[PDB]
């Protein structure tokens, strides 16, 4: 019956490990945007949404919040950061005989660093 399938989530509980909202059917879940779904976004024109959708409504943790806020404030929202599950992937990989140097190349002396 209809009620058997109705849902909504402004926001709610997240995941454990991977903080992205806890989508399972009973309890404030969230719509998963698989590749083929993103294949309908980047296939379209202006795809910010994409971006953000990928993050602030799922992962930049702090990103999440303070967005939220930022609307409550009454203005726009701030630029995102990097989602989580990246950072996670680092970890694994690193945990497996790696030397990941995600890293910038700045200065006129072009500067090679690394990061968190």
């Amino acid at each position: 019956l209809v009620d058997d399938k109705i849902h909504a989530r402004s926001t709610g509980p997240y995941s454990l490990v991977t903080q992205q909202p806890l989508g399972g059917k009973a309890q404030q879940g969230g719509q998963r945007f698989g590749e083929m779904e993103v294949w309908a976004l980047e296939a379209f024109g202006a795809a910010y949404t994409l971006q953000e959708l990928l993050t602030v409504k799922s992962d930049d943790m702090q990103g999440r919040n303070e967005a939220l806020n930022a609307i409550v404030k009454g203005k726009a929202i701030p630029r995102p950061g990097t989602p989580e599950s990246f950072k996670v992937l680092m970890r694994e990989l690193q945990s497996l005989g790696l030397d990941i140097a995600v890293h910038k190349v700045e200065t006129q002396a072009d500067g090679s660093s690394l990061d968190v």
């Binding site: 790696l98 030397d99 995600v102 890293h103 690394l114």
Partner: peptide
């Protein structure tokens, strides 16, 4: 950062 550096540990 710009590029990643795959490798070993």
């Amino acid at each position: 950062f710009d590029y990643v550096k795959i490798g070993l540990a």
